[PDB]
């Protein structure tokens, strides 16, 4: 019952996976070839290892933030909320747009879980703290908060966000986007935030820009002295094929 957690344990072969991705990423991205992938894993491991899973700080990931510093085009950034798959498909098609997971640090840890025990210096493959049920300040959660902060700060000009029309309330303040990303959009650099609301399978013919959660988002962004555009993506499949040609 001591160090029993609710969320799933560390991903099988987590060390091998992170390195494999780091090698693969540097091959694809020539500007990040200066990064030593062993050093990245050291800074990654040292963050959460030999430390309690419920008491992680941003300074634990500070050394990893330095190793994985990256300068993507800040006018060509795409945020998302509960639309990871389609947002990635968009950036995979149109290559000049970047999501968080198209950066090194994001690429490494995407769809991965990890944590470590306090006493030992061994990774915990049995279980890891759930954000809601167990502990908010868990390795995964604290990582994503740190990287999403730096990524959101770096953005400028016209930032985009891809939302989900179907999933209940479209904008969610309690989400990582609503809490972290939105609040770190610096108005000095950022000018506009255009929202792309994606529909289901030709279910809603209505306009989802009048949704009160978008009006909230509008109000939030407006109070930061930032413009708020909003568009409807009625056909997602044709939209992906559109940007292709």
């Amino acid at each position, epitope marked *: 019952w001591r160090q029993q957690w609710s969320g799933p344990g560390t991903t099988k072969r987590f060390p091998e996976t992170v390195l494999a991705r780091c090698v*693969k990423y540097t*091959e694809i991205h020539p500007e990040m070839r200066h990064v*030593d992938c062993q050093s990245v894993w050291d800074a990654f491991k040292g963050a959460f290892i030999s430390k309690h899973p419920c008491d992680i700080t941003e300074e634990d990931y500070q050394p990893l933030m330095k190793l994985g510093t990256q300068t993507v085009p800040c006018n060509k950034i795409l945020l998302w909320s509960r639309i990871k798959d389609l947002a990635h498909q968009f950036t995979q098609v149109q290559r000049d747009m970047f999501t968080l997971e198209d950066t090194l640090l994001g690429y490494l840890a995407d769809d991965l879980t990890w944590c470590g025990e306090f006493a030992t210096s061994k990774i915990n493959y049995q279980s890891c703290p759930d954000w809601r049920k167990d502990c908010s300040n868990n390795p995964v959660s604290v990582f994503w908060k740190t990287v999403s902060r730096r990524f959101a700060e770096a953005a400028c000009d016209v930032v985009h966000v891809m939302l989900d029309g179907s999933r209940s309330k479209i904008f969610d303040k309690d989400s990582t986007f609503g809490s972290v990303e939105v609040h770190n959009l610096q108005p000095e650099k950022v000018q506009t935030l255009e929202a792309w609301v994606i529909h289901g399978g030709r279910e809603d013919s209505r306009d989802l820009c009048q949704d009160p959660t978008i009006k909230e988002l509008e109000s939030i962004i407006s109070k930061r002295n930032i413009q708020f555009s909003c568009k409807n993506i009625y056909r997602p499949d044709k939209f992906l094929q559109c940007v292709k040609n």
Partner: antibody
Amino acid sequence: QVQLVQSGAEVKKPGSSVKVSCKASGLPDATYAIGWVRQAPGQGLEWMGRIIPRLDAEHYAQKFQGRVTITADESTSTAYMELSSLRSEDTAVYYCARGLGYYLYSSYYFDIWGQGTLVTVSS
Amino acid sequence: EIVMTQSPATLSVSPGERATLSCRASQSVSSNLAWYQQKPGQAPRLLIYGASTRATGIPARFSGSGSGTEFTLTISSLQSEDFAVYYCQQYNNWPWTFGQGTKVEIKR
């Protein structure tokens, strides 16, 4: 010091699969990279993919991906490449080579190559 | 993928003359460009990497230069043993791509 020795040439039927070996020897470190290149008349030198035997990490070119799978036996220091759904255009000399770069996991350019294996796809 | 285009197709020079092989990348490849030498019935031999840097045990005769979309290989005091097909290879963009080749022929 390093030497790559590939398997011999052979004939294969259209649609069948081939598996070419590559026994490395005299490798300085445990972390190395084994690239794969084929040479066909008309197409020329085509990049296929890499492997990092320790990490068990593979990265393929989009053209071949799906058909190509590179495996490796880390103890014998032998890399393998399997190419399936063989067509007439896959008749070529398949090379392996040690990947070079600033790091030991890098495979950008290649200095030591294998002897090459002429796979012929014919009924 | 990036299309490496070498020129000329073939080149005919006497021993002692300076062979000048060209290489054009469809898009910029920084200085991530390697040169190779393939003699008959052999695997390629790495001459240059990083645009200009020679490999181990490669004569000073062979000289790489250029960056972006325009590279060059220069063979100073050409010899008869320098009969080969010379290839370039970008490694700035995955997947790696090679040129079609530049065959050097010897005049006697």
